[PDB]
């Protein structure tokens, strides 16, 4: 009977073909070239295959390249090869929804994986790490843009803020892997990085929104600033109430305890994210999910392990979708060689300054030199916020009908895409490498 590599490959290809055929039979034209579901399925498969292929290649001393690069390249190729792009189209609504769901899953994972005892003893450190680097990188990015790119100050700051938020989708999985091996959980480095990861897109989005309002002279800056404070407050409050709720009611006496708990956390996080977006407070959803998951994990001292295992499986399913869609958002039109050199220079210098500032922001936290270096190099990744708000400035400029503002929006979009491309894979690789070396393993 068949066995070995041939059996595995035949089973996998049959499963892929069968999934597509089932979807086509149920739906019909929607799962044929030019259809939404066909595009989604093809993007999913291509992202998975690219991740695996990139993981396979390891010629030099360094470990294999991350699957993030494979997924991003798969999406990029699907978008920027005309023949494939014509037959692979995904509605914007579906892409946004899938990316939001992936964000919810990863935020739940991060919240469940935090350590309460460690998080208690590093409070100021987390605040500094979440605030300082973003603001300093935004300021220096605006300074660079005003000179290399010629942008005015308002647009320079729009660029800085849209280039100043790290992606939990890149940081959380790697730090969770490290925490699984106990590689740095003696001072709480994984907890510090996972906690601060989710509070960095409320300072970035708020700054970007207020600067955009100033640039287009629309509305008021006071309300735009206060929106961020309100987002923080309502996120914390909703997360607290929901976490204390699910922490108690699903009780040890119920039969399907694990299934009910996982459904509750996942559904509540997804509902929080989507409803917050709907009601005009985007960013309180992530904080609410983080707080709720953290409190629920505190409630289930050790019974949460199965919940996080199921969520990890869900994340393994959803990561290819997220990163393939992020890659598909970018087009070679933005990355044209007219001025791409200066955009790359600005992104590079901004990243260097961000690393330098992150090193300084953790100086007085009691960490050793190696931990400081690891934290500095584990805080660069930038994937999700940049893709979410990358083209908003250009769209607003287009709506207003101006032409110079369109040029500025084009520069902002180019910078965002370059930052994603040259920061997500390098950051993931650097975390994977420097984890075992610089962090003190525990038993």
């Amino acid at each position, epitope marked *: 009977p068949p066995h070995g590599l041939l059996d595995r490959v035949i089973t996998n290809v049959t499963i892929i073909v069968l999934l597509w055929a089932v979807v086509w039979s149920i739906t019909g034209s929607e799962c044929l070239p030019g259809g939404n579901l066909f595009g989604i399925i093809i993007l999913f498969y291509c992202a998975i295959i690219g991740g695996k292929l990139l993981g396979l290649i390891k010629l030099p001393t360094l470990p294999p390249l991350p699957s993030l690069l494979g997924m991003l390249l798969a999406g990029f190729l699907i978008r920027n090869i*005309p023949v494939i792009n014509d037959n692979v189209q995904i509605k914007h609504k579906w892409s946004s929804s899938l990316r939001s769901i992936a964000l919810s899953i990863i935020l739940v994972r991060a919240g469940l994986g935090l350590d309460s005892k460690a998080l208690k003893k590093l409070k100021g450190v987390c605040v500094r790490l979440s605030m300082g680097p973003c603001i300093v990188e935004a300021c220096t990015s605006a300074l660079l843009a005003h000179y290399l790119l010629g942008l005015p100050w308002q647009w320079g700051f729009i660029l800085g803020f849209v280039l100043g938020a790290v992606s939990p989708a890149v940081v959380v999985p790697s730090m969770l892997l490290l925490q699984g091996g106990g590689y740095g959980v003696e001072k709480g480095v994984p907890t510090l990085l996972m906690a601060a990861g989710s509070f960095d897109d409320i300072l970035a989005i708020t700054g970007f929104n207020t600067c955009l309002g100033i640039a287009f002279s629309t509305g008021s800056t006071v309300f735009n600033v206060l929106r961020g404070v309100l987002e923080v407050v309502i996120g914390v409050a909703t997360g607290s109430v929901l976490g204390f709720f699910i922490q108690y009611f699903p009780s040890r006496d119920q039969d399907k305890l694990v299934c009910k708990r996982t459904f509750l956390v996942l559904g509540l996080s997804v509902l929080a994210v989507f409803s917050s977006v709907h009601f005009g407070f985007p960013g309180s959803g992530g904080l609410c999910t983080l707080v709720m998951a953290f409190l629920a994990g505190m409630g289930w001292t050790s019974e949460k392990a199965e919940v996080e295992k199921i969520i990890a499986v869900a994340w393994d399913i959803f990561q290819p979708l997220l990163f393939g869609l992020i890659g598909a958002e970018v087009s070679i*039109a*933005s990355l*044209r060689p007219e001025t791409v050199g200066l955009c790359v220079a600005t992104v590079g210098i901004a990243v260097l300054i961000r690393i330098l500032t992150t090193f300084l922001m953790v100086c007085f936290a009691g960490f050793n030199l190696k931990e400081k270096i690891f934290i500095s190099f584990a805080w660069l990744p930038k994937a999700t916020v940049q893709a979410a708000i990358g083209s908003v400035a250009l769209d607003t400029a287009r709506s207003h*009908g101006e*032409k110079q503002l369109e040029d500025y929006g*084009m520069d902002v*979009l180019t910078v965002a895409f370059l930052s994603i491309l040259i920061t997500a894979p390098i950051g993931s690789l650097l975390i994977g490498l420097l984890g075992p070396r610089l962090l003190q393993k525990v038993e």
Partner: antibody, heavy 121, light 108 residues
Framework: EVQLQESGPELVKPGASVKMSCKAS????????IHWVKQKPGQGLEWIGY????????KFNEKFKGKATLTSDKSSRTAYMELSSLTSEDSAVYYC??????????????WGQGTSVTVSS | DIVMTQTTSSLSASLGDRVTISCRAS??????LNWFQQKPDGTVKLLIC???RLHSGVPSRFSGSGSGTDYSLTISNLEQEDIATYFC?????????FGGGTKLEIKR
């Protein structure tokens, strides 16, 4: 070689509605903007609006708002314009031109051949 | 409302001289003053984008000088296929406004 083909001349009765198409070949259709220009005889050209054939957002000149309805079909590779409640002053040539929306020095580099529209009874 | 005015609607020109089409805007467009050419048969081709940036494939005889709010397009030498109507367009603001057009009649 990139060219755009529009429908032939059409005659319509006043108060009726007319659809005109613009089929683009020789380039990636969804990668550019489709701009509609109306040239009435004697007068100069008049920018009607444009359609982004990637996510279907249309911008219209205030004069032609309501009178024109822009749509596109990626599969068909064509862009359509709707002219409702025609009038004797709506009789003129209509052009479709592409424009690179993500280029800092964009313009309308390639134009259609024109689509004479005559509104009479 | 950036309505663009071309002073001359029909300028006579010989077959070996330098012609200059002048276009002025009712506002301050920085440099977004694309030039178009329409031949008598009804074909319109882009000539010069962004004031002076000659478009690909256009003969070198066309030079889109001029800046501020008073632009001009020049022909180094006049060829028989140059006889057409020339429009100056501005995309500085939202409503893209074309010029009145200029007709090149051969002097005799």
């Amino acid at each position: 070689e990139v060219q755009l083909q529009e429908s032939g001349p059409e005659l319509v009765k006043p108060g009726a509605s007319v659809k005109m198409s613009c089929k683009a070949s020789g380039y990636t259709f969804t990668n550019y903007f489709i701009h509609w220009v109306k040239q009435k005889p004697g007068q100069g050209l008049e920018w009607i609006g444009y359609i982004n054939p990637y996510n279907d957002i249309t911008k219209f000149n205030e004069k032609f708002k309501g009178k024109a309805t822009l749509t596109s079909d990626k599969s068909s590779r064509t862009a359509y314009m709707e002219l409702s409640s025609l009038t004797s002053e709506d009789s003129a040539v209509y052009y479709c031109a592409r424009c690179d929306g993500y280029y800092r020095y964009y313009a309308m580099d390639y134009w259609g051949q024109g689509t004479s529209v005559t509104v009479s009874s | 409302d950036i309505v663009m005015t071309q002073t001359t609607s029909s300028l006579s020109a010989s077959l070996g001289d330098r012609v200059t089409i002048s276009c002025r805007a009712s506002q301050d467009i920085s440099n977004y003053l694309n030039w178009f050419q329409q031949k008598p048969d009804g074909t319109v081709k882009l000539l010069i984008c962004y004031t002076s940036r000659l478009h690909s494939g256009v003969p070198s005889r066309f030079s889109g000088s001029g800046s501020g709010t008073d632009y001009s397009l020049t022909i180094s030498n006049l060829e028989q296929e140059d006889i057409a109507t020339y429009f100056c367009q501005q995309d500085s603001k939202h409503p893209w406004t074309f010029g009145g057009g200029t007709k090149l009649e051969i002097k005799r």
